[PDB]
Write a protein that binds this ligand. Sequence first.
Ligand code: A1CE0
Ligand code: CA
Ligand code: CA
Ligand code: CA
Ligand code: CA
Length: 622
Amino acid sequence: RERTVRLQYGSRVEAVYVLGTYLWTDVYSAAPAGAQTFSLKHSEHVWVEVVRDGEAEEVATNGKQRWLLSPSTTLRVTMSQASTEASSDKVTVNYYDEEGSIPIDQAGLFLTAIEISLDVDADRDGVVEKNNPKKASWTWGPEGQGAILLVNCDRETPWLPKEDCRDEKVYSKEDLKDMSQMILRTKGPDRLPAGYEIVLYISMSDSDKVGVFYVENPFFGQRYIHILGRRKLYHVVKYTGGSAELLFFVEGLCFPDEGFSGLVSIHVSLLEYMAQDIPLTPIFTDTVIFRIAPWIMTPNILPPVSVFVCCMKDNYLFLKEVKNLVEKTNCELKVCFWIQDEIEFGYIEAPHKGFPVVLDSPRFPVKELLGPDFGYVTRSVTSLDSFGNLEVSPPVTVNGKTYPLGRILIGSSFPLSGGRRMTKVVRDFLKAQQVQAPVELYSDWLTVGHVDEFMSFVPIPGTKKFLLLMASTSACYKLFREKQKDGHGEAIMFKGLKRITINKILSNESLVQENLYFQRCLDWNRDILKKELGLTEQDIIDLPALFKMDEDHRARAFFPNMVNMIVLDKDLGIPKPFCCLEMHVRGLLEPLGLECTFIDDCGTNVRRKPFTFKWWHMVPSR
Ligand SMILES: CNC(=O)[C@@H](N)C1CCN(c2nccc3c(-c4nc(-c5ccn(C)n5)c(Cl)cc4Cl)cccc23)CC1
Ligand SMILES: [Ca+2]
Ligand SMILES: [Ca+2]
Ligand SMILES: [Ca+2]
Ligand SMILES: [Ca+2]
């Protein structure tokens, strides 16, 4: 890194030299008028080179050699180690005329070398390495580098009704565990020469994205100092002489969104005082880049950790079955007296730390969710703005492109339909997360308009494969037609959930045509899913489903939607239809090793283990 340091006419120039740079010095400009040649002397820790246009010749400490003065003959000054005393190191140039061997004048350069390095964990191993060259850039992949920073959205101290990042304060030593470390490492004399200061700084744009902290008095009662962030764009650093390391704790405040890529930068500069009324000049600048970790969703294939359940006191039939199914599995259960519509359990991870984050958009919050190691982020709205109209596939590979965290699926309407669609802000937020490349399916053919009404995923136990379960109106009519022929014709359906029989349903011509159109809608999605998830007909199961068409021309479940089930590894919590429909579902799913359990019904939301795959090992599209 070449830096210009000109010699000033017959005068000494004193300057700070930052290690990692090298000086180019002009000696012709400072020479007196009539000077023909020049000579030089330099100290041991200053390699000096006389450069006569291209060719650079190294020069001895006390050389008596003289070179002709020319604007194309310059110097190249390089230092390798920091100074222990302010001046010490120097370059001296003597000037002579045509007839004379005693200097007619001399210009000097007194130097003070220091090392300045703003270091972060760019290699992603949890420890702040010394000056990673790739720290001023963020690259995706297992062979890529760049520091990662979480959003501090949990509540270490539960008194305040806001999250850790809503304030510009740190109250606990636990809060520092959710922060990324940034160390300012320096070497130099006891003090900086007169006219120099080191300043840490951020842009106005990045001020509502990061929060930089310092631990003052760490040997007794520790206090935490907010030095960069909201309304603090720069901070003057106290220079400690010799070999020093200043520890900083950086926090994220924003998730990547529409207009926020996720990348933030923190800079350090050595500013040189020129005069009063004039701004200090950044002589040296070192920068570090951080990527704010995205909010990631968890598919049904990931193992369950704990089941959150919301219902009423009278919902004892539901409560017993859900607890009996949760007993079969090796996971815990929580009760709350909207559950799968207003909240969703996701996670955030960094090389050092990782914890679950709940996204909540209420159409005040829920106490059983906010706390330590559990983030809680909160937000016109149609019925399509719901967490039921959101799904996430297991990891897929679609024509060479792997999606190791799956893909988010969102319900929508056809482009020229004029129908309902999720808000542009939600779609932009999920898209901005990048790691789960969202796909828009067609759910507007349903009265509610949710993708969980017609689809879901189940793993194949003891394998790393899964199945897409699709609602099928044709599967229902084929089952009915068979039972009607087998003698079960006048049998009453939904006995415990009108007086309807198979014969009555099959005779209803108008209902046949409605379900014919609804099967078309289901197959439109089946094609988008096979296309965007790399699925074949071997990976899909058709569960019998029946619908009724409202005045808007949309579907609404005739009997309980069996596809919206609780997936707890090999154990499925399927909604009871009120039984040949249950025996058909047991015949489709049970031979594959999936134990079915029909529930009476208000809903559930399962917190799962995050993926083994670290999101930063991915390589997403632009
Ligand atoms: C730490 N703070 C920050 O980083 C903030 N600066 C960000 C945080 C993210 N923000 C949001 N933007 C869009 C959608 C959001 C949803 C959300 N809400 C729903 C939903 C469910 C029912 N409704 C009616 N809406 C569904 Cl489906 C999906 C999502 Cl992501 C929830 C909660 C926050 C959202 C923007 C501001
Ligand atoms: Ca490291
Ligand atoms: Ca805090
Ligand atoms: Ca914290
Ligand atoms: Ca925490």
